Amino acid sequence: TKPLDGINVLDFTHVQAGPACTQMMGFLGANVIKIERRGSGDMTRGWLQDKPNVDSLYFTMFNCNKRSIELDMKTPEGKELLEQMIKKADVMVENFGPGALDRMGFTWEYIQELNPRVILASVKGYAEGHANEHLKVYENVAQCSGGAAATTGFWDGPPTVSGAALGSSNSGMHLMIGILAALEIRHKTGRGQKVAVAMQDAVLNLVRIKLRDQQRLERTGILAEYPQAQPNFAFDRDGNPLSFDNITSVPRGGNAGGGGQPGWMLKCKGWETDADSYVYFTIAANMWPQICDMIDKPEWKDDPAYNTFEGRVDKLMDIFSFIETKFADKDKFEVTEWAAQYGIPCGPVMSMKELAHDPSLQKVGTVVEVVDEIRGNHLTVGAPFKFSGFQPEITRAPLLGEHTDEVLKELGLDDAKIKELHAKQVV
Amino acid sequence: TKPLDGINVLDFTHVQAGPACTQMMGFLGANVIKIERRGSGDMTRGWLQDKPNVDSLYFTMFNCNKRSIELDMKTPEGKELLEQMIKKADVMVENFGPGALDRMGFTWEYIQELNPRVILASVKGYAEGHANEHLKVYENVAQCSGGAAATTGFWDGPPTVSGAALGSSNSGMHLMIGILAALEIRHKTGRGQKVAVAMQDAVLNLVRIKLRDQQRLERTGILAEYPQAQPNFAFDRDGNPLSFDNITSVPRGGNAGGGGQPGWMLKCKGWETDADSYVYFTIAANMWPQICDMIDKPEWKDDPAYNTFEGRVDKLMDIFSFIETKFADKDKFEVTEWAAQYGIPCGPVMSMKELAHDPSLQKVGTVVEVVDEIRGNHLTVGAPFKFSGFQPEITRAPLLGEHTDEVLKELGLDDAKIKELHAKQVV
Ligand SMILES: CC(C)(COP(=O)(O)OP(=O)(O)OC[C@H]1O[C@@H](n2cnc3c(N)ncnc32)[C@H](O)[C@@H]1OP(=O)(O)O)[C@@H](O)C(=O)NCCC(=O)NCCSO
Ligand SMILES: CC(C)(COP(=O)(O)OP(=O)(O)OC[C@H]1O[C@@H](n2cnc3c(N)ncnc32)[C@H](O)[C@@H]1OP(=O)(O)O)[C@@H](O)C(=O)NCCC(=O)NCCSO
């Protein structure tokens, strides 16, 4: 049936990294109970609201398939309720500051005593043992810490953050691997473990290819697939020439190919007024005859100045600028269809508007309309992994404290005790 | 212990997306057998080599903890060997182009018949059922299809690819989630499933916050925290003011926060000569009093135009221009310290040079020195999830076909048939 049916998750998370992890677990069938601050809740509820006093799309897109209980954990009665909840949980997830759970009385040691089967999973800024262990970090600071910012953007501009959530959502997906790995250990040992993912580390994992580059640069002095290896192409803001003679750390390479074959971002019709009217166009080394046919340069097929990767190093940017002239009168999609006829990896820059209403992504369940009769329906991203014998059923995000009484009832508390906790401001 | 100890992985993968998945399963204890083409093998072997006739760092950094066998699969005797290997495998992983494995005769349907416990795990460019289902896709093509390029970069520049591998390794890590979720399904049903991750979809999942923004924009006409909603700050190509008039798709926001918590990328001493001499500075609403102390401006505490997120939406870039001047004679690390005292999320742009040789990252096993006695040692990224009861043991990447006979003997074949496979040009 569903992979995580019958898995109970005690979810202390807030913001993005932690909640992305537990939401996706929820999508795969987990029973996720979200513990929130009494009164305000997860701060995404109030961040960037489109309607005042309605939970923001920030909250709803990260907290589907979850229930909510308000709990003040700084009270002693709040701690005893947590212990009951820990004893019934298979995994606890937290992305609080570095030592916050510990300060609350719940160290890994004490959790093991309460439930020797439970898995404790956390997101942190930096790994335990790191000099910067104790630092609070959000999305973009993590991108900077893990090498993405340094290697994203242009040689003549600043380190640039990625629009993708490399620090936070990525950390949450990384933690999901850790939790699932820990569930596989537990099948063998009958015991829970602690797993942790540092945001710096989740970022650095995606930037593996740039650590390849750093070593290539140290060993050889050149990165031949980068624009700066073309003589007299790249310049700094004062017009000084940029070459690998003077580069000792992997530079920004604009829209160069990364771990793909060489490529560039080429303008299509309307690029002046439409910010997303571009394609990415790849010059794979085994496809030069095809490219030559497409752009009507038969003379470039047998010329060694043009027909190997090595021959193209000194002129690759000129070749891209010439290919680009062939797209001046065609939109993204026509250029993509044209290239497809040749088998050339090439695709449009899809705008968020285009993605939000794309039939294909709705059909395959990647962009999903959530039914929310309280707030109005909204779109979210569903499960990016598609299975032959299981479909996710995405349900709306909880109102703050919506399930508090319902959850306290599942723990076995009589109606009178639930009454008292409301009065003492515990729940 | 070792999470995937005893899990047998038949690994057809090549390039980045698939190999990152299987390598990481290998780090967690899985037994990974990499099937490669005779003669050339995985295309990363020969891709941007730093030494002639030595496996490239592209290959070594993505194929540690794996054994290698060469196989001609377009041969009848090769197809028979695969059948036998499929009978002994828990998961097959593949990232050939659309229909490639099917064309070899190994459809999901036939695979089930051969071993009803096996998991088939696949990376493609686009999801099955998508209009672009049949297209071949590298790294940056997926960044473009999944919305990242459209939303990364500056408002007066092109769509920009991330240096991080959003398309390839990111898909690989999502596929790992999918595979481990199928192993959990299998504990219940006794049966294998097919799992697939589309590169477009793995990208989209990390761009969830931008689909939030797209809906905020459709509903309200504005994104108040984006540079373009700041009065007379952003300008287009021509000397011309930008605003959310006529913006209907989420625009590029340079180095803006991307969420509920504003930030920017600020220069530090050395920025003209050092591409990575910068910090990122987040302005968390709840830490606004803490910020006013370090900035040496006590006036902003009581001012209602400066003490709330709402009051700050029209002079965000004025505050950042000012905070930047107090960094002009301190390096990255000095500025990061000068904060930190105050608990401020602010950190340095780390260069690849700094990360490759950083003591902390090597202490925690995130950057790892691989002992490779054939090729010379190299660095790699280790496991980004850290466990209380388990340490990865990373071992060197295999030579092409280094383990062919070893693997052919584990299948129960004799010495003399191993010879005739060599002579018939199948192994
Ligand atoms: C997000 C953040 C950077 C900043 O968080 P913050 O605004 O400083 O809050 P915090 O540090 O998590 O929590 C403050 C305290 O309140 C407490 N708290 C949280 N929820 C509580 C509740 N319901 N009841 C009582 N106390 C609670 C915590 O115990 C914490 O401990 P201390 O007072 O002893 O320091 C930090 O939580 C963090 O570093 N998290 C890890 C990184 C991460 O996962 N970020 C993801 C999203 S990034 O875009
Ligand atoms: C990456 C890539 C674009 C490369 O494309 P390509 O170089 O043209 O290779 P391919 O299309 O995968 O394989 C070519 C053929 O050789 C075959 N092949 C592969 N290994 C073989 C072997 N050992 N013996 C015989 N044939 C083999 C395939 O069956 C395929 O056969 P067809 O003629 O029936 O299509 C493509 O594999 C792809 O789209 N993969 C899926 C998406 C992906 O993961 N890309 C990420 C790469 S990381 O950026």
Short mmCIF file of C-alpha atoms in Angstrom, two decimals, chain B residues 97 133 158-159 167 178 224 259 334 365 400 420:
data_model
loop_
_atom_site.label_atom_id
_atom_site.label_comp_id
_atom_site.label_asym_id
_atom_site.label_seq_id
_atom_site.Cartn_x
_atom_site.Cartn_y
_atom_site.Cartn_z
CA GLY B 97 17.26 7.48 -22.23
CA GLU B 133 8.31 12.11 -21.99
CA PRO B 158 19.13 36.10 -18.23
CA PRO B 159 17.69 33.00 -16.60
CA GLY B 167 19.00 18.56 -12.21
CA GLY B 178 11.96 6.51 -3.66
CA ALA B 224 6.04 43.10 -1.61
CA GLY B 259 11.19 33.69 1.84
CA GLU B 334 35.76 38.97 10.61
CA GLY B 365 33.51 13.21 7.28
CA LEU B 400 36.76 -0.64 -16.01
CA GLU B 420 34.21 -17.99 -23.85
#
